[PDB]
Amino acid sequence: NAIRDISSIELIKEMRFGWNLGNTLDAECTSWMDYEKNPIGSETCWGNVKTNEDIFKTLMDNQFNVFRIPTTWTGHIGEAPEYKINEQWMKRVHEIVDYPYKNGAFVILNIHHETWNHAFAETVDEAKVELAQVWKQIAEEFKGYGERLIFEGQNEPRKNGTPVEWNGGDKEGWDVVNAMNAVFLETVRSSGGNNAKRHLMIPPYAAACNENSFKNFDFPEDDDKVIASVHAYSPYNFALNNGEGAVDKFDASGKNELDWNINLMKKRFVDQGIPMILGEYGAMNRDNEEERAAWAEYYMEKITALGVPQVWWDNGVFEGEGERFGLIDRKNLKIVYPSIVAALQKGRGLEVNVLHAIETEP
């Protein structure tokens, strides 16, 4: 029940690097799964195994101490306007949050792939109501948790389906996102318990590392416990491109693009005293572990000099046509790419010591 009363800038210093529990509690399968009969079945409906504590303990052995829990509440929410969250779902989310928390790590709980938080001015009034009701129950469920539990108001709020979805945003989307962020901050701060001193993360438009999203991002000026949430899979062709133009080498043009976006984070947040966390990043598997290792160490070295931690996005996908950001085999508790983890440790300034590494095939 104890909570330290320290600023986000001071609390961020205790962070090394992070890991995402992707394609798990954020998996959304309402188009074919009966959420009434399977109230917690969505956790594994995208191919990941049921979450256990040993997954996080395997990662903490490799010096991970930040764990982001992407959670989708669509399908687990009752009818409007009360928006009652399913009790069995809230309990399972509580159990998974306890896995890294009860072992002493930082935890980030967010609202992820929602159908109702689209950044369209047509439905903001009801979207703000649902956002407030949902975060009221979440803040209530985790009242007595300390400063190591961090709430992230939104994931990538955007105008889905528009050409404006992934280009940075327009004036309409920027105002809706700012209004939604304000509702989230007020709802948590107004609740009781430790929530008045809990650290809160808010994203710009779509959490994009873009000038248009950075320029039109309202940030509170009198709350030292609010953090900016940015996602940056940079450079795009090497890290995120899953189609045409995808490259497997980390070339000089890729370094220039990455250096440009890291400088955008410095000018927007670091120089202006805005605490910021790279909540999502990573490089897709292209049979290029040593290319991704050098990229990861360079990326980690740069933002470590800025005091910004990063959180790897791990969806548990290794092969196939999907986005292959897998890093740990959750069923066998093994690090599939040990040199990538070693690069994170070396770039962060830690002693290189990779445990539970996968064997060598040759």
**SS3 letters across 217-278:** CCCCCCCCCEEEEEECCCCHHHHCCCCCCCCCCCCHHHHHHHHHHHHHHHHHHHCCCCCEEE
Kindly report the number of other CB atoms within 10 A of residue 332's CB atom.
11
For the chain, where are the alpha helices, taking DSSP H only?
8-12, 53-61, 87-101, 124-141, 171-190, 211-215, 236-239, 252-265, 289-305, 338-348
Contact between residue 307 and residue 12 where contact means Cβ atoms under 8 Å apart: yes
Catalytic residue among 43, 147, 280, 291: 280
SS3 label, residue 107 = strand
Strands 149-152 and 106-110, sheet pairing = parallel
Across 133-143, b (16+ Cβ under 10 Å) vs e yields bbbbbbbebbe
Catalytic residue among 156, 165, 291, 297: 156
Contact between residue 117 and residue 127 where contact means Cβ atoms under 8 Å apart: yes
Amino acid, res. 26: D
359 is catalytic: no
Amino acid, res. 182: A
Distance CA(13)–CA(273), nearest Å, equals 14
Provide the 8-state DSSP code for 151.
E
Kindly report the number of other CB atoms within 10 A of residue 215's CB atom.
12
Contact between residue 105 and residue 65 where contact means Cβ atoms under 8 Å apart: yes
Amino acid, res. 222: D
3-state helix, strand, coil in the chain (%, to 5): 40, 10, 50
Distance CA(49)–CA(166), nearest Å, equals 30
Q: Is 37 exposed, middle or buried (0-12, 13-18, 19+ CB in 10 A)?
A: exposed
Residues with Cβ within 8 Å of residue 59, at least 6 apart in sequence: 19, 67, 328
Q: Is 54 exposed, middle or buried (0-12, 13-18, 19+ CB in 10 A)?
A: exposed
Amino acid, res. 207: A
Contact between residue 96 and residue 51 where contact means Cβ atoms under 8 Å apart: yes
Question: Resolution of the experimental model in angstroms, please?
Answer: 2.5
**109 pairs with which residues across the strands?**
69, 151
Angle at 337 between CA 112 and CA 278, to 5 degrees: 35
156 is catalytic: yes
What domain count does the chain have? Answer: 1
Kindly report the number of other CB atoms within 10 A of residue 212's CB atom.
18
Angle at 348 between CA 311 and CA 7, to 5 degrees: 65
Would you mind telling me the total number of residues written for the chain in this entry? 362
> Which domain does 22 fall in, by range?
1-362
Give the tokens for residue 12: 């961020």
Distance CA(264)–CA(213), nearest Å, equals 11
Contact between residue 289 and residue 340 where contact means Cβ atoms under 8 Å apart: yes
Residues with Cβ within 8 Å of residue 97, at least 6 apart in sequence: 69, 107, 109, 142, 149
